[PDB]
From a paper:
Outer membrane porins (OMPs) are an important class of β-barrel proteins that form water-filled channels in Gram-negative bacteria. From a clinical perspective, OMPs are important in modulating the diffusion of antibiotics into the bacterial cell, where mutations or reduced expression of the OMPs enhance antibiotic resistance. It has also been shown that OMPs participate in F-like plasmid conjugation, a form of horizontal gene transfer where plasmids are transferred from donor to recipient bacteria in a contact-dependent manner. We have recently shown that the efficient conjugation of the multidrug-resistant R100-1 plasmid into both Escherichia coli (EC) and Klebsiella pneumoniae (KP) relies on the formation of mating-pair stabilization via interaction between the R100-1-encoded OM protein TraNα in the donor and the OMP OmpWEC or OmpWKP in the recipient. In addition to its role in conjugation, OmpW contributes to virulence as the upregulation of OmpWEC increases resistance to host immune defence.
Here, we present the crystal structure of OmpWKP at 3.2 Å resolution and draw structural comparisons with OmpWEC, both of which are conjugation receptors for TraNα. The structure of OmpWKP was solved by molecular replace­ment using the AlphaFold-predicted model. Continuous electron density could be observed for most of the structure except for Gly41–Phe52, which were omitted from model building. The OmpWKP structure consists of eight antiparallel β-strands (β1–β8) that arrange to form a hollow β-barrel in the OM and an extracellular solvent-exposed region. The extracellular region is formed from the extended β-strands of the barrel and a single α-helical turn (α1) connecting β5 and β6. A hydrophobic gate is present midway through the channel consisting of residues Leu89 and Trp188, as in OmpWEC, where the extracellular entrance to the channel is lined with hydrophobic residues. The extracellular loop 1 that connects β1 and β2 is missing in both the OmpWKP and the OmpWEC structures, suggesting a highly flexible structure. In the OmpWEC structure an LDAO molecule is bound at the extracellular region but loop 1 is not fully resolved, suggesting that the inherited flexibility cannot be stabilized upon its binding. This highly mobile structural element on the extracellular loop is likely to shield the hydrophobic face of the extracellular region and it could transiently open to recruit hydrophobic substrates.
Author numbering: 35 to 52, 65 to 224
Write the structure that this text describes.
């Protein structure tokens, strides 16, 4: 329904895709319905924790990130639909912090890791099963276009490589009408 503000809570799992690991964290959305079908959502999560490895070296590094995302949405159906799927599009902001190499990587002549903040596009496919006037069950799949820079020191020498990451976010949540 229009003018409605609700909040979902549940699991948010991020899978890098462009060797980096996956991590599942608490995910909160704060959606506001503009019309009966247009919504404006904000994704927010607890900081993720990804282990980083490559080929022979293995888990050499570890980075944390926060990927808030702002989305314009379209909910299919009408205001009396208990099953409303939705598609979303909008920008992502990703910030990295507590980058640190481990014992394995620090013996490889590796120091000072820092990924630069990234902005990019984000796509969205979700589904709201509305249980009643207040409760709902939700699934959403996110595709974000992430472009950071990897800065590190190889044996004291500055390294600087740009990557594309394009991770998938899978949220299984449960919302409430506020």
């Amino acid at each position: 329904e229009a003018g409605e503000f609700f909040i979902r809570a549940g699991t948010a799992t991020v899978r890098p895709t462009e060797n980096v690991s996956n991590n599942t964290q608490l995910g909160l959305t704060f959606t506001y319905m503009a019309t009966d079908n247009i919504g404006v959502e904000l994704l927010a999560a607890t900081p993720f924790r990804h282990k980083v490895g490559t080929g022979p070296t293995g888990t050499i590094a570890t980075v944390h990130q926060l990927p808030p995302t702002l989305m314009a949405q379209w909910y299919f159906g009408d205001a009396q639909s208990k099953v409303r799927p939705y598609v979303g599009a909008g920008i992502n902001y990703t910030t990295f912090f507590n980058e640190d190499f481990n014992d394995t990587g620090k013996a490889a002549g590796l120091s000072d890791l820092s990924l630069k903040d990234s902005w990019g596009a984000a796509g969205q496919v979700g589904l709201d099963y509305l249980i009643n006037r207040d409760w709902l069950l939700n699934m959403s799949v996110w595709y974000m276009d992430i472009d950071t820079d990897v800065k590190f020191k190889a044996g004291g020498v500055d390294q600087k490589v740009s990557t594309r990451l394009d991770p998938w976010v899978f949220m299984f949540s449960a919302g409430y009408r506020f």
